[PDB]
């Protein structure tokens, strides 16, 4: 889906498995990853087109926030593909996963 910013200026982003992820900050600022999780925390988000409701909504990859901060922080824009290759592990096999990333844009 589209990145959404709340009242405190934190931009969130929800990107499905196998898709391209683009984080971007305006001129003069750099990305600051607040949160990061690659897995499944919702039944409704990124529905499989096969009509199989996901039964695993307590799926967590704890290395996600640390791998996103070493990849996107200090940079004004970040690119990668969301799959099990980028986050080093499959936190719940046979469950559709997605990266949910929230980030702040701070002056370097």
């Amino acid at each position: 889906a589209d990145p959404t910013t709340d009242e405190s200026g934190t931009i969130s982003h929800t990107i499905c498995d196998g898709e391209a992820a683009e984080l971007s900050c305006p001129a003069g600022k750099v990305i600051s990853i607040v949160l990061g999780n690659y897995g499944r925390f919702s039944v409704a988000v990124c529905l499989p087109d096969n009509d199989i409701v996901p039964s695993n909504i307590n799926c967590q990859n704890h290395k996600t926030k640390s791998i996103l901060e070493k990849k996107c922080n200090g940079d004004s824009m970040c690119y990668f593909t969301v799959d099990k290759k980028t986050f080093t592990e499959d936190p719940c096999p046979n469950t559709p996963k997605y990266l949910e990333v929230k980030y702040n844009c701070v002056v370097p």
Partner: protein, 939 residues
Amino acid sequence: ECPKFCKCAPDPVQPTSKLLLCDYSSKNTTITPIASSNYDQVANIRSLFISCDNNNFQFPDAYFKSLTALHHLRIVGCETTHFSVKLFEDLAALRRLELDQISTASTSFEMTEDVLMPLARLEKFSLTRSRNIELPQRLLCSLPHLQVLNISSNELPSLRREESCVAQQLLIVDLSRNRLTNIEQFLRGIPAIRQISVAYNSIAELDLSLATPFLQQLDAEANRIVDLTSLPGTVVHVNLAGNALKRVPDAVAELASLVALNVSRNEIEAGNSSVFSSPELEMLDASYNKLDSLPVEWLQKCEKRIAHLHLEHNSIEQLTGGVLANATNLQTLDLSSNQLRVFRDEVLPENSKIGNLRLSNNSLELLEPSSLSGLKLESLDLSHNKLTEVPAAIGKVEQLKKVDLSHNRIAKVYQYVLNKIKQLHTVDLSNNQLQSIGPYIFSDSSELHSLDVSNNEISLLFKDAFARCPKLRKISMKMNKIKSLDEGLTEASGLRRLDVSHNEILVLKWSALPENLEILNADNNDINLLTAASMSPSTANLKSVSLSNNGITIMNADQIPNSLESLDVSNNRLAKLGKTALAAKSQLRRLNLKGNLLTVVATESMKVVEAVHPLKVEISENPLICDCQMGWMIGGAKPKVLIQDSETASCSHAVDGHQIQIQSLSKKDLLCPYKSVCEPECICCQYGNCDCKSVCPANCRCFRDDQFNINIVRCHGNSSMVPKREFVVSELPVSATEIILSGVTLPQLRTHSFIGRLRLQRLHINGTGLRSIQPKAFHTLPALKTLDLSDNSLISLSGEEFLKCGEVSQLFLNGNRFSTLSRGIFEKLPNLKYLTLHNNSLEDIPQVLHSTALSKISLSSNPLRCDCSWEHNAAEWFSLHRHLVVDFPKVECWENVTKAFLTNDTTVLSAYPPNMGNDVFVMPIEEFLRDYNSTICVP
């Protein structure tokens, strides 16, 4: 063994023998013969008691057999009309017979001259409390060895005796409480009599000097005696209370050794002073009389022998001094209820033994300082008088132990009056006009026990007022103007019950209390604050406290002393209760929250740390809320707090606010709303897209239960500011188990609106303007059981919107535009039991509803066509299924009479004249099916 319905006992008069106590009141069962029970100690039964309350109780002829050693027999309440003569043959050792209540206003009892023939050796015969009895005129002839005769409370109008019968051992006669007017014939010829009690009768003329010459005690209370005729010179006790006395009768004033005279409640005058003769009169009770002043002719002979003088309710104006100045044996003097104004000094002797002096309800104005000089008084009464202070006649006694000075006009209490008496146990200064309680007016009374200054004007308490008294234990100050308790009672460490109720005390300091107080009462004050009961040492000994009708608005752990066993804070303004107020107070047993303004009384304010006992609570009359925090109100916790008034205690509901009975409050009501929360074990709670995160949408109220099982989301578009946006269902909480979007504006259900809601059980998207339902909008709802799409703009429903909803059993389609019921409904609603399709546009009965498992269905207010059954009519399905319709008298046949003529679709209903103003003829459905073959469908 003791026989049937009777219990043995060792005889009190003779503890070596065996008493028996029978109670055949219990039942109408048979009367076991005592001789046939062969009790091991029948000859040890010397006294025998029987008690009944049933009527017509008759003894078996063979009952009192083998009791040949029975000396005393008491029969109580066993009514009859006569006893068996054979019964009293085997009881020659009987020395004392008692009968009590053997007849009422109905049963007539006759003491037979032959029933008592085998009862000569009866040395005491007692027959009390019974009406309409007949005694033989030769009653005394059967019982000559008679000594004490008691037939009281029997209302016998006359007593007649044959003149040949002489009771020559009759000592004490009891005729009291009867209707006797003259008995001379009975007493004539019975001279042994020494004691007579003809009390409570209507005797008019009494003559006894030539009848009972040894009469020693005469009791004639409550009669019509105007003046006596003659007495024996032996009378030592004359009781003439409640008679027609206008002066002292002569034959009593002439007595030789009269010890006591009670001529009270008469209308005697003290002008007609007869001269008393006996110098042995030691007690004189001329109370409730019309005396103007004490006559000296009376006491003239017993000045050094008189001891007790009760003289209340007379009209003594002044004790003309000198009359009592020689009564050295005078131990009691009662002069209450007269018109004395000054109790002068020359009335009493110098060293009188007076221990009782009673002078209440008088006009007493002055007690001169010498009338009570040197007295050894124990009890001094002077209430309802006109004293102006505590008079110094009372400084002279040193033995004074109890004092009453209430309802007077005392304005002040000095130091010397009530200090110089050390032996004073009790003081009363209530209902006076004290303005304050001065210091050291109570110090040197180190034997004080009770002090009363209630119903006064005390505005202040001096710090030193209560020192030097380590025995004063009870003080009452109710109904005063105590506006503060500073200083005044901190020092008296022997007090145990203090009264400061009905005052002006604004704030309550526990430190401003004595240190051994055990009962406190601060009722009907202005108290609105409780100090630190934890930084106050004078709380360790407090057991009960009542702060009812005050203004305490909060109570915490520090304001509730931990050692109290009782607490009463009823009719206060308690909105909060500190959340550990009853935690560390393990000793409390009762708790009164009656009449407060509490709303949420949390579970932690009643959880008692290691309470061994049930905690009693009155929590009625409080604007409570029954939410999930009132878990203790159901009673499944320990300590198991038991609500006393759960039968009237009420609370309002957590959703709508209707009244709930706390007695019938269940685990289902306790809802406590929220705006955002997280389930147990929820890992993504910090995130925005989290399933276990229950975030409330705008314009929605969200409730829940304690354990994340109930989740009510009840949204409403009851806004005159009409929702200019559809309702976005994707914003609702994920774990919702009931959804009501009712009044909001939502015209379309997209594909996959409700996907993945496994917990959802009720869904009421009614009143949203739903025109279209995209398929799979109700996807995977396994616990979904009730669906309500009523009162919208739906015209037909396919069955492709319902995917995986097998548990559905209720579907509400009323208030729409439904004309057809497809088959796709029952292929996906198997558990379907309840259905509503009333108030719609149904033109006929859908032919899917001929083979369905519905149990209740509603199909009224629908334009249904009724023909004579071309095989599918309405009245044909209805006469077969009219039980399935909940509103059968609410369905009506419709036929547009204007269309069916132009379309030639002629039906049986276009031949009646249509309703005035309409093109349709309307007839109730019951009228069509009853009149089916009778008139309508006849060819």
